[PDB]
Ligand binder design. Sequence first.
Ligand SMILES: Nc1ncnc2c1ncn2[C@@H]1O[C@H](COP(=O)(O)OP(=O)(O)OP(=O)(O)O)[C@@H](O)[C@H]1O
Ligand SMILES: OC[C@H]1O[C@H](O)[C@H](O)[C@@H](O)[C@@H]1O
Ligand SMILES: [Mg+2]
Ligand SMILES: [Mg+2]
Ligand SMILES: [Mg+2]
Ligand SMILES: [Mg+2]
Lengths: 500, 500, 500, 500
Amino acid sequence: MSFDDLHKATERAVIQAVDQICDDFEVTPEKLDELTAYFIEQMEKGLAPPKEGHTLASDKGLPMIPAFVTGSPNGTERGVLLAADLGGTNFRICSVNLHGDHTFSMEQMKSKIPDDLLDDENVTSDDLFGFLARRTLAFMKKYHPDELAKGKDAKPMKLGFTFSYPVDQTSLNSGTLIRWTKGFRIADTVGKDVVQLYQEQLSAQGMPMIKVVALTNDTVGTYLSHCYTSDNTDSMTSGEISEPVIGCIFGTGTNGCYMEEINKITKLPQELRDKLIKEGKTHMIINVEWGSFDNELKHLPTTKYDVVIDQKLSTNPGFHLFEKRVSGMFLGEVLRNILVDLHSQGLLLQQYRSKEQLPRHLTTPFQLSSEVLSHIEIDDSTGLRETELSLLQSLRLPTTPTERVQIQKLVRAISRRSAYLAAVPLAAILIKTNALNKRYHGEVEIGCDGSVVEYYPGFRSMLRHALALSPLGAEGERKVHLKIAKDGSGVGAALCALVA
Amino acid sequence: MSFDDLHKATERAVIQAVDQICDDFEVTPEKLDELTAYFIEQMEKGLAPPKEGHTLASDKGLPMIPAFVTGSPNGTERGVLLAADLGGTNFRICSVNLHGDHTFSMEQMKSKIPDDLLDDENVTSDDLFGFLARRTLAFMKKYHPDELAKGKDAKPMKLGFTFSYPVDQTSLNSGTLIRWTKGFRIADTVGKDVVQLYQEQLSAQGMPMIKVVALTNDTVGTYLSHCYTSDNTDSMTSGEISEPVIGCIFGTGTNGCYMEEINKITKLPQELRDKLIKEGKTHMIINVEWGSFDNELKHLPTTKYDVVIDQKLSTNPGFHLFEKRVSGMFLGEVLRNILVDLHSQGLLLQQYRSKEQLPRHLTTPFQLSSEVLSHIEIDDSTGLRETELSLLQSLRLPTTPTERVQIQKLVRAISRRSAYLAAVPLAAILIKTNALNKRYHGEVEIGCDGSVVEYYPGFRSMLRHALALSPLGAEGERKVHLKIAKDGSGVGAALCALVA
Amino acid sequence: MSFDDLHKATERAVIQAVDQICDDFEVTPEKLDELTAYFIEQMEKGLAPPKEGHTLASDKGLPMIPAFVTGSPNGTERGVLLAADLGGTNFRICSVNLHGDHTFSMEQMKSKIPDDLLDDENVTSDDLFGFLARRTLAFMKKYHPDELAKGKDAKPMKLGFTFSYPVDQTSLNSGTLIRWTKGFRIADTVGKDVVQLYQEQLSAQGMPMIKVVALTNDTVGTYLSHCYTSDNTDSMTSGEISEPVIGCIFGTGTNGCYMEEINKITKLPQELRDKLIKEGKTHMIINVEWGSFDNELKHLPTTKYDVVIDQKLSTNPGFHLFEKRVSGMFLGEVLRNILVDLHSQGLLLQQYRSKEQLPRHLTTPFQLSSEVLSHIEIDDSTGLRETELSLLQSLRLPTTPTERVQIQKLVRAISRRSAYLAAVPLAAILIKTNALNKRYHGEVEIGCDGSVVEYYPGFRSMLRHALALSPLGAEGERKVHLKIAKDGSGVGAALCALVA
Amino acid sequence: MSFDDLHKATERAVIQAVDQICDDFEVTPEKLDELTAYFIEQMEKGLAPPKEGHTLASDKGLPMIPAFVTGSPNGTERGVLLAADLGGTNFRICSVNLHGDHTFSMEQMKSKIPDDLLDDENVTSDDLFGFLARRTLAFMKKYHPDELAKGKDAKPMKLGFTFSYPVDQTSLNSGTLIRWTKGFRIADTVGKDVVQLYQEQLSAQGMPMIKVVALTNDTVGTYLSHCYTSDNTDSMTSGEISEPVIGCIFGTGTNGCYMEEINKITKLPQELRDKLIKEGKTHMIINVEWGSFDNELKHLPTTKYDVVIDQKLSTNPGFHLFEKRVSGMFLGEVLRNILVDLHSQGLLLQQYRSKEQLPRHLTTPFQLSSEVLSHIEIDDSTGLRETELSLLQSLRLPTTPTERVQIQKLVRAISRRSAYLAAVPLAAILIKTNALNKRYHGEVEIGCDGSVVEYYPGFRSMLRHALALSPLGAEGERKVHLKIAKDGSGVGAALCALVA
Ligand SMILES: Nc1ncnc2c1ncn2[C@@H]1O[C@H](COP(=O)(O)OP(=O)(O)OP(=O)(O)O)[C@@H](O)[C@H]1O
Ligand SMILES: OC[C@H]1O[C@H](O)[C@H](O)[C@@H](O)[C@@H]1O
Ligand SMILES: [Mg+2]
Ligand SMILES: [Mg+2]
Ligand SMILES: [Mg+2]
Ligand SMILES: [Mg+2]
């Protein structure tokens, strides 16, 4: 045994731990099927009246929100509307000029949500909504300075507001916050009317001229934006015309929505179901809180790393268990926990004696962005050798050549687990509504927004693969196109405000 | 307001524009009566000597041509004669074997008039007449190759020549072109002898053996052909025997002719009226240039779409205003202008941003054939849903379901306007000559040739209806039969050549 | 037995004959597989050196032409070039402004090929090429009148010439006509240089300024045009990037071409293969004369109606047997022969006593356009009842209600036979070159031009179905997109002239 | 010429433009020498009294600031002090426990400077300093919550304040802002006392307990931190003991400072020079505003891209010309301007028709971070092929394979130009003070902080190379070590506060 043979014995120990992790992470079709079936069962429960002791702030299971849109655009909608979009790492304000030909011209200003609003439980509703109103002034000064200069007399501006949190919507115009998720801890807005808080701050800042017309989700805005764009009006002689079914968000969090029959939403008051069916409003866009799927954990492929994020690092433990396996914030956090744990086992970061000596950004939660993971996974031979080091050097964590390949294997296992689980709600929705066979012919479109699905170098293809593996089978995959709703939330909110 | 309600609001706007057009197009009996009366007044003027400053190339009003036929056949005429027929979208050569029993056996060769002769003002008389002579050689090679092989010694062939243009006829044998109409722009034949140009080209091509015997119109040939065929010799005990009164053309253009008393044609030289009355030639077949009726526009139900065709798209602006409302070329063009105008209003072709993006065949004049209109109008429920799309797809213009019904309404309004106006000259002629009461009993026949009246799925019945609405009343309609002179122009020219 | 029961007994006899025909026409997967395999065998033979006694004018089998393009565009090509396109029912001249962004702006003039050039064996090379030169003058007068006015001094204009006939190409600049097909009988151009004849006539007409730069086929132009347009440059993170493989023509005739490895074309001189491989010219676009597939008839599903067209009605008996089953000219002719034969059997046109009394346009060959078939097939319930009559009325053939449904069944059987046979060459080409598996991922595009594939209300979907039935299987169909190369031949020739 | 040959001709055009740019960017030793010599001349002028008409807000040339530190640490300094650090993309607060053994334990909180303070001229002193005070409260709540809870009675906290802007320092305790640079436009703080504004806001927010003890630069803090750490106390028998000479910042901006003899600072009042020399204070740490070197542009290798940044995009045109060639903000901006200009020339982004169609983040200034450049440059073969696309995809700019290599060449040319120019001030300082020969033996240390020097995968080695190329020669490079002052500004300010 030379030093090189002794080193190989160590490398084999490292490899076994990494392979064990990779196998714990991979989703096998058997679980993909248990999950699709369970997802559908929870979807039916999510439409049902609550039992005694249940509420929305505390529910568990897979709740659904009956957003009152009740239809979809065809691209002919026209007009200029404002849109606000809150809830990722950032906030955006758009001015969307809908042209009536399946396109729009969008102006945009965007900013990061300041950490003053995210790291402290003592942050109030006035700090968050005061922020949004100040950014709204900045937007108006750049794109519509005249309306701002002429307000209060200039009027109205119609604004749609996308707010990416579960909202107990009662009307397209308004609803209340059910809970904060995804990084916000601002407790005094839970139960309050989201539009009311924003609208009051807009007036407080000098813009009584801007009226918030509609409150929507990101999933809904995405679906509607997707519907507005492309064509879906081809010739009936081209042989097949597609239809939008499902909207997705794969960003800091994960969600989607779909068109559903109004007569099946048993929790909606019957009087409202009757009022709407009488006008031909046979369908609603339902926000399925995918993130909450299996919060009780009867089927998801949970490992110890997911337990740690959910119980110790997350802002809302016990909720949004699906997101913790799928969305961008947790793809990042899962790798960080693995690297720290393989430090403790003495397998990767062998040079440190012990955890307290690790780089501070490695031990601090959420400092490993899914952006680094994107580069870690795409890197091929020379990327892995040289760039993987640069990518982790930016997290102050220098590594060896052999360590870098082991880290890449962990990253691919993490993103694969997510991409396959991410297919569960798409298969489950298409199957529940029989989207694939409600019509003899016509393709199924899924309009997905969010930076993980748009940029992660692997999701577009891994979802298609996973859909084929799920109960949809190859035949279902053949009907189903994953398209990107790039301007997704912005256009969607503008359309919601147009609808009012 | 859901997307579906917003879409209905748009559909209502579309409908209002289409209904406004349909109402502008419909001819009400009040105008049908003003027009019948005006038509008769212009017919009397059309027989009168001209005033100083008037000529035939430039006249206005409703000119008539005193074709020198002076009588009608009874079906006993026999012999084999050639016939040439120029002036629609095509040209035909026939060899008609008249059998003497109200029937004939017709051989035919036909060809399209090449665009080389239609789209350029620099086309000469030698190109048009050279064309006719070359097609004549082709005809002879197929049906009478022996006469061609034996010519110059084989002789004579007698040919009748139907030339569908106003001709200043001086004798059945010849006359000059008054103007070009209906698509021809060959200026150097205006004022020239039509037979002379054709006869010279026949010799130039090697056929000195063929003599053009008679020059006729299509209206005249149709009347005579109609008279030749059926019976009109039934028993006097069958209770009632009919007589031919009016011939019609409803093809690329529109015209007709009728039998008139020679003593009323005040512009004909008196010496000629005397020469003919002395031989019992009490009547002449008069070509009424229906197409020119109301060229000055005092009564026709003119809309902006007709103004555009007459001033911008037509080959002879200011003339043939009636045809522009009635004939096949303009049924086609009127729809095209409406669709382009409803594009500009944002009502039908809503997907284009603006006119320059429309299919090139939609913006190009005369590319919308009345043939497409025929199918657009006949289509019932499933035809409208599926075939209307195919019909416009052939014009490269894909449409929506709701657009297709709106287009069909416009098409029916266009063909109805034409069919009712088309009744004006038939009512006006029968009334002026008192065809309905010159005899106690005996039916009135109108022998109409032309593809619009023969195939358009609506003219046969719409004219009968319109005749009943006009001053003829139901009582006049009861005397009047619309029959189709199917082999119309061919037989007619053969008879004209037989007459010489 | 009442009259109605006796009539049903007759209808059953009619139905049996129609069903027998429909079954003779349907292509079963077993034959679709024999044909794909045979097509591939003949394709290999088509690349081989000839045997003694063989030439190109007379070959039989499935010849291929090694067009010297040797590559494909990526959309960045820019410049303004002229293009001429001869050989369908018409001729087109374009001026194509290539912009370098996968789009172009095309100006166009088009005209029908006059019958003077099609119905007579005594037509010479000077009449056909004189025609093309005259239409070229007309084009220049409308789009580039200044170049024409300034020529001879203004120069050069670069023109690509698409000539849809087999051409024994020796260089992209020129080659000779192998045979006339598809309606032309002009024997004295066979064996002559196609460009030389056109170029001389352009000078004869006054345009020494226009140089014909490249001679191409329609199949080649279509492939290149298809390649030029869309993108095929998406992100490698979108998950899959497509590549053009096969170009198609489904118009008056049928053909296609594909990219092939130069080292496999064994008949090309080795010295030329070496000259080209040394510059990286690893592939050529090969015109596969699909029309000639199985001219000897060992596998095609031939019936008596196809025998009649090939031996009695066609301009080139014994050749282009595949086209006679597939292309637009013969979809039309096959129905006509069936209707005449069912007249002779006393089943459809029961009112005539015998063939000589049938409408002359029914007994005359090629008067039944595939355009009528398009409408006959698309028509649903009310279309069949009312429009089928109008469509055949335009062929002067009035029918009964029961006759109309029987005719529609025959039409669908005819177009299905064609659509399935039409898939044979696409499956055969993709399989021979392993287009489906030469790369792990990336879609396969087929760029098809021609009015049958673009407008016939059934081909887009019937080909996709047939491809799945053929040896490609569903898995091959999943890679394969049928797209329409709408401006196909025009752009292609402009690119060929750009290439020179 | 095949499509592939035509494409190569285009690629050659692209390459020539890229090579021309690369050659314009490369710094040749001849200029490196002109610049070193000029830098020294301007350094002498920078110590001189001003001429009439000169001030500090407007100076030009290379000003120096005589920070009143007057000495350096040896690692024995002990105590716990707070430190604030403002002025990059972010702001940091530290609590540094100096231990007296060349090490310290640092606690840290950091946040991004909100855009509310950077994009608007109407931002006031109260918004910037209010921000710093609020972040200070957050820091105290996490690391010293007891002092905050006990204040006002708990006291004092001693805070050092690093403020990375030129400051007209009069005492280590305070000075005024000379100008804003590097992204700030807050005009009403220019001329005001920097400590006074911060100190007042700390009291306003509830922390009268924290006293700002010292105001320093980042360059000074870095030098002192560097001096505090390692050893520099080795045995005199180890053969050679090093000494710190120069501190550097290579972050969003670029600067450094060095120890200089007090008797040479001719602009300092003589009375102050005498007061200090009498106590043995023979040296001062002088901030050399490297960024301002050659603001008048007599020697820097200026190209058109640098002119655009300086005159159109920068917050302070005419100043800090050296930084615009060297620092992280402009490495980013220079590439962006090149890519847009090569779009205009039609060489890289060939698919767009024109600038208005480019991705909005490409045309927006400063959206291309030097972070992307880091990855673009490090990428080797497979990194360039796949990751370069991901890196630009994050700027919404998809590219081709050939485009990616051309972009990488531009990036390496940009970072090389910077790295070589970046050596000018280090060579110039060591040469001016004869750091290399003031002692027979002992190494020269340069302590550089800042993320470009710490992470850019190329600076550590390119500076060493450039130093050898400059007048220092290989012999000077052999004395000179580039080390990283990682905790640099934080420790430095804590030491400045310890010094008071
Ligand atoms: N290129 C990338 N590769 C991988 N992950 C990325 C990339 N860019 C952003 N992300 C992830 O996406 C998150 C931002 O999500 P996104 O841009 O979709 O905003 P969002 O719509 O506001 O999110 P949400 O809708 O859930 O609130 C980041 O925190 C990071 O985790
Ligand atoms: O137009 C389609 C095809 O028609 C004929 O079959 C020709 O042989 C062929 O070269 C051409 O491409
Ligand atoms: Mg979002
Ligand atoms: Mg006629
Ligand atoms: Mg063609
Ligand atoms: Mg700094």
